[PDB]
Write a protein that binds this ligand. Structure first.
Ligand code: PIO
Ligand code: PIO
Lengths: 41, 41
């Protein structure tokens, strides 16, 4: 899946530390420590 | 303004690294260098 910050932000998603914020679901990582790639369904 | 991660997330915003993603307004920081508190208008 997604594991780098460029692809994450180019896929309609955001990078967030630790956990994905409310209304976002985790779809991968952004390659940075403890950072998740997060997207609203 | 908002300057800690708790108040940022409890205000309906996100702590995004480096910059606020497209369509998010920066409303402060999450207390750490390189974190922006970003809220969707
Ligand atoms: C060169 C300067 C570098 C800084 C530039 C600052 C970057 C900046 O200000 O814009 C954000 C940008 C991506 O945002 P960008 O708007 O381009 O991405 C679009 C967005 O994902 C849309 O949701 C997509 O539409 P859809 O949902 O598919 O329908 C759209 O697809 P398409 O319509 O185009 O096909 C995407 O293009 O981020 C980075 O890529 C790398 C950041 C590095 C990560 C750092 C953060 C950890
Ligand atoms: C979760 C793990 C990941 C976390 C990663 C951690 C992220 C990371 O470490 O970088 C964030 C940092 C952002 O800077 P940062 O959030 O600290 O914001 C600066 C800070 O507010 C200073 O106080 C300001 O100076 P002053 O008070 O007014 O005197 C300064 O104003 P100015 O100087 O702008 O005028 C602000 O920029 O990076 C960059 O600068 C540009 C892109 C960096 C390169 C990246 C490009 C891809």
């Amino acid at each position: 899946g997604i594991g780098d910050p460029v692809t994450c932000l180019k896929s309609g998603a955001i990078c967030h530390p630790v956990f994905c914020p409310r209304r976002y679901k985790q779809i991968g990582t952004c390659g940075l420590p403890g950072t998740k790639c997060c997207k609203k369904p």
